[PDB]
Amino acid sequence: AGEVFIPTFGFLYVAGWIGYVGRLYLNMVKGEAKPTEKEIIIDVPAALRLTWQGATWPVQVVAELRANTLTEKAENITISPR
């Protein structure tokens, strides 16, 4: 199990951790004044207050699936003309 198997989950946990923390920050700067100027000059303070929040990302991600908040409504996403 130590080969590939166990290592698989290890990456998945950190991978989802990185992704979840990123979306947490993105969705906080969205709304805040000029959200485009907090992507170039990163708010290191708030970015450092969201890193540990991704430790229990699996618990929070599921709670969002079982609440319909992880994804967006299909009638609010712009789509290319068919």
Partner: protein
Amino acid sequence: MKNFTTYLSTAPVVALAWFTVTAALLIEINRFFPDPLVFS
């Protein structure tokens, strides 16, 4: 200092820092625990 810290927060500077820490961590890990092929 408010505006120097603003510069040290810009994407290029923050990425340079984050990566250096991550790289050094992996280097130091292999330095003390070398040849990590399997999780045993």
